[PDB]
Design a protein around this ligand. Structure first.
Ligand SMILES: CC(=O)SCCNC(=O)CCNC(=O)[C@H](O)C(C)(C)COP(=O)(O)OP(=O)(O)OC[C@H]1O[C@@H](n2cnc3c(N)ncnc32)[C@H](O)[C@@H]1OP(=O)(O)O
Ligand SMILES: [Zn+2]
Ligand SMILES: [Zn+2]
Ligand SMILES: [Zn+2]
Ligand SMILES: [Zn+2]
Length: 533
């Protein structure tokens, strides 16, 4: 059951006691906070028989000091794991509203700010014990990665190492200095994802907005449409009997669904902070969906830096989408303002616990605000709620309402099987918007095949199993890194190239470095720099 480590860094018991003792001394200094921790818990003194059956592996300050003094810690993580054990035992056993629970939380705060620089001085990422957020009484621990030259154990999420990107294995920054050469480039970046004219439009509008703000904390934003496919919304049986038998309305409605994401560079790395799924009903779509766009899903992670420009950037993305679909030929936008059902997430797997879920009222206000800005910029000609709109156009039948995939209305019309509807439209106050944007529509962007981003479910399921949470800036940095690999490899397979001015399938091609997509034949008729691929 062997293995070889050629230059394994190891610590002498004096190095470890010298570096780790100041952090233990800092815990002991907390008075009277450290007092119920300076010795083992005696359930005979406290009257708690329950204790040892709850706390399987007891731990206290005296035991850690004894272990340190006798040299029982061989590696620094051994020490930090025992300090975190003592904290977790106290948090597990005691009530959140108890003296010793609060004492524990204070000691943990001190340990966090003391052990981080200490572990960092020993060549480590940090000194935290990390466990992943609950699922479906046991938690999954965060992954580790040992260095190929050093042999030291570090948090994979801390170091942002992924074998797929760096297949030669993990080497810590300190060993890379000793080599002399830098860590190789992450070519699975958000910037390197397939560029689309729609994504380009939202990226340019959201980047020119940030240039006007002069914020130093703000980093370059990338908007990429990661999946684009052609689907149809089938008409549900009750409505089918009422309108498709007569021929008054279609059996299915053809739409193109698009999934786009927003990424911001934070601390030199990509961080995904926004995601949106839309449905687009074209020129050849029969009524009642002709020339309409519908935001099916919308989700965000609150790590956009700077925090103040967050909602303002979100509005620029939405307004940019309404602007791009207007110039293509779409005439009506539609928004269903419905905040997420309690725990459940729309697009991003694990939300930050400190990220607030807007109340339906607040969310209705949020969309109203962006639409006011869109109206002021002469992008949107008008916007009204679903009730007010049905009277202005004098709608008399159910076949007149736009019928979207996964929308509330197809289900409302359907549950009138047992059966009042016009009252239900008024019932849902400002939760249904109608946006007025004003020659067939011709989408210049090619269909991007990506099963992960074909439906909200595929990405949510994969991130749930792979633990790609979006609950902290460090975990979101990791999840973005892994998500980008999945998109890059599930999009690498789809690469059929044709000549832009001849249409024949070409293998060797000249690509323009200035254009978005410019691949011509072997012969060359152009201005900007072309490159042989
Ligand atoms: C079916 C559909 O398509 S519905 C689409 C809507 N999608 C969602 O609701 C998904 C989850 N929501 C989100 O990701 C975001 O809240 C967004 C993108 C909708 C809005 O982005 P933001 O403007 O950053 O969010 P929001 O308006 O909620 O937050 C603004 C402030 O209100 C606060 N706030 C939000 N919800 C609440 C609440 N329930 N109680 C009190 N305050 C709240 C936030 O803490 C924040 O405070 P701060 O900015 O001073 O720190
Ligand atoms: Zn770490
Ligand atoms: Zn190393
Ligand atoms: Zn060109
Ligand atoms: Zn050609």
């Amino acid at each position: 059951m062997g293995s070889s480590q050629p230059r394994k860094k190891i610590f002498k018991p004096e190095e470890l006691r010298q570096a780790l003792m100041p952090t233990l001394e800092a815990l002991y200094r907390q008075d009277p906070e450290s007092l119920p921790f300076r010795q083992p818990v005696d359930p005979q003194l406290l009257g708690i028989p329950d204790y040892f059956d709850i706390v399987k592996n007891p731990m206290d300050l005296s035991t850690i000091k004894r272990k340190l003094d006798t040299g029982q810690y061989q590696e620094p993580w051994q020490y930090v794991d025992d300090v975190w054990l003592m904290f977790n035992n106290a948090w597990l056993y005691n009530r959140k509203t108890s003296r010793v629970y609060k004492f524990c939380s204070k000691l943990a705060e001190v340990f966090e700010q003391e052990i981080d620089p200490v572990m960092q001085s020993l060549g480590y990422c940090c000194g935290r014990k990390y466990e992943f957020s609950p699922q479906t009484d046991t938690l999954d621990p965060e992954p580790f990665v040992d260095c190929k030259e050093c042999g030291r154990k570090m948090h994979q999420i801390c170091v942002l190492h992924y074998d797929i990107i760096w297949p030669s294995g993990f080497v810590c920054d300190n060993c890379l200095k000793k080599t002399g050469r830098p860590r190789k480039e992450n070519k699975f970046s958000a910037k390197r994802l397939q560029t689309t004219r729609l994504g380009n439009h939202l990226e340019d509008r959201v980047n020119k907005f940030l240039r006007r703000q002069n914020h130093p904390e703000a980093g370059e934003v990338f908007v990429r449409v990661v999946a684009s496919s052609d689907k149809t919304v089938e008409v549900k049986p009750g409505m089918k009997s009422r309108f498709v038998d007569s021929g008054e309305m279609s059996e299915s409605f053809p739409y193109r669904t698009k999934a786009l994401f927003a990424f911001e560079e934070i601390d030199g790395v990509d961080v995904c902070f926004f995601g949106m799924h839309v449905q687009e009903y074209g020129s050849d779509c029969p009524p009642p969906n002709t020339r309409r766009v519908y935001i099916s899903y919308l989700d965000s992670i609150h790590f956009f830096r700077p925090r103040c420009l967050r909602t303002a950037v979100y509005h620029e993305i939405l307004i940019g989408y309404l602007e791009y679909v207007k110039k293509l030929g779409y005439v009506t936008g539609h928004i269903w303002a419905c905040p997420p059902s309690e725990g459940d997430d729309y697009i991003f797997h694990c939300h930050p616990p400190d990220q607030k879920i807007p109340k339906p009222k607040r969310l209705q206000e949020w969309f109203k605000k962006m639409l006011d800005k869109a109206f002021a910029e002469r992008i949107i000609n008008d916007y009204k709620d679903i009730f007010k709109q049905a009277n202005e156009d004098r709608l008399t039948s159910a076949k007149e309402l736009p019928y979207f995939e996964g929308d509330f209305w197809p289900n409302v019309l359907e549950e009138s099987i047992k059966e009042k509807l016009y009252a239900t439209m008024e019932k849902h106050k400002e939760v249904f918007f109608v946006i007025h944007l004003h020659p067939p529509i011709v989408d210049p962007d090619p269909l991007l095949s990506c099963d992960l981003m074909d439906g909200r479910d595929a990405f949510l399921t994969l991130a749930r199993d792979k633990h790609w949470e979006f609950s902290s800036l460090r975990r979101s940095k990791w999840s973005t890194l892994c998500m980008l690999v999945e998109l890059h490899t599930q999009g690498q397979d789809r690469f059929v190239y044709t000549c832009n001015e001849c249409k024949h399938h070409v293998e060797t091609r000249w690509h323009c470095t200035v254009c978005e997509d410019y691949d011509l034949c072997i012969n060359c008729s152009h201005t900007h720099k072309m490159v042989k691929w």
